[PDB]
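Support case: user asked for a sample of complex input and structure output to validate their parser. Sending the pair below.
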Amino acid sequence: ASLTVS
Amino acid sequence: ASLTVS
Amino acid sequence: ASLTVS
Amino acid sequence: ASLTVS
Amino acid sequence: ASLTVS
Amino acid sequence: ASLTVS
Amino acid sequence: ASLTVS
Amino acid sequence: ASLTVS
């Protein structure tokens, strides 16, 4: 699972 | 901007 | 899922 | 401007 | 919703 | 520095 | 959510 | 130095 922020 | 969780 | 703001 | 949640 | 950069 | 989104 | 770099 | 994401 992933948490992506940009 | 984008925050993604999955 | 996503939160997008721009 | 746009806020999206899905 | 809020996007902050600083 | 910070990028905050919520 | 928060991304910090310092 | 630090990279913090949450």
